[PDB]
Structure formats: C-alpha cells, structure tokens
C-alpha cells in the first residue's frame, strides 16, 4: 500500500513537471520567434 | 525492497527535474522582461 501511494503521488509530481515544461517550451518558442521577427 | 529503492531514486530524479524547471522559468522570465523593457 505504501509503495502504491508513493507511485500515485509521484505521478502527480510528473504531471506537474510536464505542465511546467510545456509552458516553458511555449514561452521560449515565443521569444525565439520574436527575436527572429525583429 | 527493490521497488522501494527504485521509488527513492526516482524521487531524487524528480527533485532534480524540479530544480531545473525552476531555474529555466526564472531565466525565461528574465529574458521576457528584458525584451519588454527594451
């Protein structure tokens, strides 16, 4: 049970890191494009 | 025991990815602000 609970919580952590990476990728891409456009 | 050890090591990996995401977020934010300011 403890191991299952740990995996469950770690999956939530993974989902949070994925959210963060997706937002950072969009933001860096927007900056790269801004600089190209300028 | 093996599963516990794997979870423990994976938690350290998660912590490392969190460190990295936090630093990248700060750095992209600083760039976004620099460009806004310019």
């Amino acid at each position: 049970n403890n191991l299952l609970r740990a995996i469950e919580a770690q999956q939530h952590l993974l989902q949070l890191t994925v959210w963060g990476i997706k937002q950072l990728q969009a933001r860096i891409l927007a900056v790269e494009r801004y600089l190209k456009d300028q | 025991n093996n599963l516990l050890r794997a979870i423990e090591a994976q938690q350290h990996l998660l912590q490392l990815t969190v460190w990295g995401i936090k630093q990248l977020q700060a750095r992209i934010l600083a760039v976004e602000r620099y460009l806004k300011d310019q």
Partner: peptide
C-alpha cells in the same frame, strides 16, 4: 491547468514531495 501560477505549482510540488517523504519513511519502520 491554464488557471495555475508558478507559486501554486511550487506549493503543489512541495505538498506531494513532503507526502512521499513521509510514506517512504514509514516504509522503513
């Protein structure tokens, strides 16, 4: 998701991390 801030993100990360620590500690006893 689109309604979440980076401060909230850090809070949620911290909360799950602390929970996992507690679970792993209890697995040792």
């Amino acid at each position: 998701w689109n309604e979440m801030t980076w401060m909230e993100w850090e809070r949620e990360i911290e909360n799950y991390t602390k929970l996992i620590y507690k679970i792993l500690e209890e697995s040792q006893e």
